[PDB]
Design a protein around this ligand. Structure first.
Ligand SMILES: N[C@@H](Cc1ccc(OCc2ccccc2[N+](=O)[O-])cc1)C(=O)O
Ligand SMILES: N[C@@H](Cc1ccc(OCc2ccccc2[N+](=O)[O-])cc1)C(=O)O
Lengths: 306, 308
């Protein structure tokens, strides 16, 4: 019910709870997230988009940032019209149902007033702090580059020119946000979403890793990717199919099971599901076939809307 | 003599010797230097301006850069209207005889096309490279700031957007210029002028430490400032008064001396003067007063034009 807990849902960290409550009292508020344009949109993008719609529905005006520059800066893509990728990216977010104010990076990040504050910011940032903020975002080049330390201050100075009271992002962005809370004049609050494990089970879910499900993928592809996933019995930590169960699932839900071995088991909470998978009452194969079907149902509207 | 040797004169290093010749053969040609604007213009600035005039005499169109932006980036000053300070510096350089295209930094270091190339350059520059190039130009901060690593690329990028075939500066700016030779497509020629030691002798000449002789200093000060200089008999290295004779005074010179100790002696070259000090044949009080009197003469026209 309460808009606080609706926002706090599935959020690993909120800095801070109290500070959020004070700016909830304000009449007009803004929340902002930024995405580097990626070819295929995966589930980790959806989870963040969910929380923006939660803030949007809570009265927030939403700013979504497309970091077309950081593609060159972080060597993500040496393509000119990456905006074309971001166009589709912008379209996919609208298909999910988030009407926001999409601000491309190249529009606002070469202005003289902004570039000045970037140097002003570099006057207060130390080399050690900047590298520390990029331990989970950068590429960790053997011969590191000057662009690595420019990425955080541009990230921090962007938050300023967007003036968003709420700054959202993955847990990867925790350190740049703490740096931004230190240097920026206004103390924006930070909402950090959990990092999804991949279907490989070894690393985080990223498109380049290939361990990703796409809202654009075909129903049979979702069946196959899940069928091969790292779903171990008695494992809830590091289990990606259990992560899908925690976030993108709707309760109650019916799991088909013949009565000889148990019976149709309707679950009403992930904590119920977590207790049954941990004590080995539910088999991974059964969990995979169940989680797959709802995901196909949930991503199907977003699919046809494209 | 020839425009080469006039340009080589009193230069520590020229990268490259063969390249400068090819630049001189080109009819149209440009050379550029840059200065962080300071309140008082000491002798160390005059030496750099001289070599621009030597480049200007050879036909090089000259560009002087005023690093108004780097007044904050290196924390040289937090004052806003540094322009008025640098505007006084403009006329000061003209009195020395240098008419040039003065380009303020802030008027171009914030453009869209310039800023973008800074990032594109940061995608080819490593952190260790920029940190080493800043060794002689740093503030020796305990916790280094990101602005220290940003500074050299802006220089390397400023050199590009000025397209100056000849990039000239102090010997401390060597590594920044060696970075521009590696990164920039046009291999600009580098001319490195020596570093003048300060009157204290322990440090170098800077407007901060106060061990400087300004071109607007009053004639009695030049005598008193030189009177308390580190002039060690028999040492030419690290001798500031010796360096004044090497780069600024004109020859031949006759030092006044009673006959009993050798009489008035005629020195026709700094090498002869350098030989006498090593051979103890010349006392510092003599060399001090002699160097001072010749200096006020040289600084007299520049000093008068500033007045009124
Ligand atoms: N680091 C991300 C990419 C990224 C790049 C720039 C960026 O700053 C812009 C911004 C910042 C805070 C609030 C709102 C906005 N905004 O412009 O809407 C945000 C994200 C990644 O690793 O994907
Ligand atoms: N480093 C100096 C100050 C300094 C600042 C900027 C600078 O680059 C600009 C430039 C460079 C070469 C040719 C032309 C131009 N230009 O843009 O006119 C050069 C020197 C000091 O520490 O005193």
């Amino acid at each position: 019910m309460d808009e606080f807990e609706m926002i706090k849902r599935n959020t690993s960290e909120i800095i801070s709870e109290e500070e959020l409550r004070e700016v909830l009292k304000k009449d007009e508020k803004s929340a902002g997230i930024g995405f580097e344009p990626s070819g295929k949109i995966h589930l980790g993008h959806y989870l963040q988009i969910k929380k923006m719609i939660d803030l949007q529905n809570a009265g927030f005006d939403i700013i979504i940032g497309l970091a077309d520059l950081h593609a060159y800066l972080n060597q993500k893509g040496e393509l000119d019209e990456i905006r074309k990728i971001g166009d589709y990216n912008k379209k996919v977010f609208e298909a999910m149902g988030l009407k926001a104010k999409y601000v491309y990076g190249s529009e606002e990040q070469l202005d003289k007033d902004y570039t000045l504050n970037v140097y002003r910011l570099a006057l207060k940032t130390t080399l050690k702090r900047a590298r520390r903020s990029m331990e989970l975002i950068a590429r960790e080049d053997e011969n590191p580059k000057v662009a690595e330390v420019i990425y955080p201050i541009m990230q921090v100075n962007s938050i300023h020119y967007e003036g968003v009271d709420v700054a959202v992002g993955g847990m990867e962005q925790r350190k740049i946000h703490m740096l931004a809370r230190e240097l920026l004049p206004k103390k924006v609050v930070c909402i950090h979403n959990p990092v999804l494990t991949g279907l490989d089970g070894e690393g985080k879910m990223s498109s380049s890793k290939g361990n990703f499900i796409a809202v654009d993928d075909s129903p049979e592809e979702i069946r196959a990717k899940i069928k091969k996933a790292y779903c171990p019995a008695g494992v809830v930590e590091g289990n990606p199919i259990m992560e899908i169960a925690k976030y993108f699932l709707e309760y109650p839900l019916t799991i088909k099971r013949p009565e000889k071995f148990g019976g149709d088991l309707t679950v009403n909470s992930y904590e119920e599901l977590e207790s049954l998978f941990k004590n080995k009452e539910l088999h991974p194969m059964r969990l995979k076939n169940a989680v797959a079907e709802e995901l196909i149902k949930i991503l199907e509207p977003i699919r046809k809307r494209l």
